[PDB]
Design an enzyme around this catalytic site. Structure first.
Site, PDB file in Angstrom:
ATOM      1  N   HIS A  42       0.794  -1.230   0.000  1.00 49.03           N
ATOM      2  CA  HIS A  42       0.000   0.000   0.000  1.00 49.03           C
ATOM      3  C   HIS A  42       0.835   1.294   0.000  1.00 49.03           C
ATOM      4  CE1 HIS A  42       0.253   0.284   4.490  1.00 49.03           C
ATOM      5  NE2 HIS A  42       0.135   1.573   4.214  1.00 49.03           N
ATOM      6  N   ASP A  80      -0.290  -7.505   2.082  1.00 45.26           N
ATOM      7  CA  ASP A  80       0.181  -6.140   1.952  1.00 45.26           C
ATOM      8  C   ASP A  80       1.703  -6.181   2.021  1.00 45.26           C
ATOM      9  OD1 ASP A  80       0.342  -3.384   1.821  1.00 45.26           O
ATOM     10  OD2 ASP A  80      -0.318  -3.043   3.890  1.00 45.26           O
ATOM     11  N   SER A 134       4.023   2.902   8.205  1.00 45.14           N
ATOM     12  CA  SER A 134       3.647   1.819   7.305  1.00 45.14           C
ATOM     13  C   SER A 134       4.825   1.285   6.521  1.00 45.14           C
ATOM     14  CB  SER A 134       2.617   2.336   6.300  1.00 45.14           C
ATOM     15  OG  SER A 134       1.336   2.169   6.821  1.00 45.14           O
TER      16      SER A 134
END
Ligand SMILES: [K+]
Lengths: 31, 252
Positions: free
Chosen positions: B43, B99, B199
């Protein structure tokens, strides 16, 4: 890859960082 | 990172910063797994709901860094990317399943006191360490609170893995076996989380058997930052290891 995960300034020098004991403690319980 | 603390120098020598070239923008965390390979969250690179789709020419990584904004001469290393690989079954439409992405550096990076790869888990290490209550370590330069406030030094927080039924109960999003969650219980007194900008960074655990650090997770998603009863979700690195190997073995 053979030398992976062993930090030059810690493990390779037999030094521990300030909070890694917290992890070991969680794997066993306490101390 | 919320409720973290400043990293010691060389504490996380596999830490990688992923940057947008222009405008200069810290996008995500990442980790070094060899002299040529960097692991991150899919992502960070591809997210169609935000019309996000970065190619190798849009990006750069910074390795060996301690300070967020400060140039650290003869220590930090800037690399360009040869190629990006996103998991072919990354699910952005629903729940961020799988992910995970790999990035190949244009040139191998020289290891030093401050630059050194993390291990990927084998089946025995996964079996030993990935248990509810056992703590891992998350690191990054992401926000210190909810996006709607930036640290100067890499942040570090240790967080316990949460039981899968509790993870499930914390969210209406359908969770999968490719994810695990980590965080403290409400009214434990202890707090901590990954936030916007952390992230793609690593969740690592140290094996008592061989003293090596292993990357068990990738910071993936969460409902809020350090919100009561809202643990962070992490890409389950061991479950996706066969894909990681296929890419490195094929394109390395
Ligand atoms: K135990």
């Amino acid at each position: 890859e053979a030398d992976c995960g062993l930090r030059p300034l810690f493990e390779k020098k037999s030094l521990e960082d300030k909070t890694e004991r917290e992890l070991l403690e969680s794997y066993i319980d306490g101390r | 990172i919320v409720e973290g603390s400043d990293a010691e120098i060389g504490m996380s020598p596999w830490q990688v910063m992923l940057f947008r070239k222009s405008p200069q923008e810290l996008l995500c965390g990442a980790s070094l797994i060899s002299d040529r390979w960097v692991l991150t969250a899919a992502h960070c690179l591809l997210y169609p709901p935000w019309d996000k789709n970065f190619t190798e020419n849009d990006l750069l990584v910074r390795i060996g860094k301690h300070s967020r904004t400060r140039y650290e001469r003869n220590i930090e290393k800037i690399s360009m990317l040869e190629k990006i690989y996103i998991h072919p079954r990354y699910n952005w439409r629903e729940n961020l399943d799988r992910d995970i992405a790999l990035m190949k550096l244009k040139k191998p990076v020289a290891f030093s006191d401050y630059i050194h790869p993390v291990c990927l888990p084998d089946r025995e290490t996964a079996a030993s360490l990935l248990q509810a209550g056992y703590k891992g370590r998350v690191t990054g330069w992401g926000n210190l609170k909810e996006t709607w406030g930036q640290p100067s030094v890499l942040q570090v927080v240790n967080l316990p893995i949460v039981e899968r039924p509790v993870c499930k109960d914390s969210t209406r999003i359908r969770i999968t076996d490719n994810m695990f969650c980590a965080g403290y219980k409400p009214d434990e007194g202890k707090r901590g989380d990954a936030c916007e900008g952390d992230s793609g960074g690593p969740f690592v655990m140290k094996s008592p058997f061989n003293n090596r650090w292993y990357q068990m997770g990738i910071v993936s998603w969460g409902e809020g930052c350090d919100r009561d009863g809202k643990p962070g979700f992490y890409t389950h690195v061991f479950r996706l290891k066969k894909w990681i190997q296929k890419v490195i073995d094929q394109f390395g």
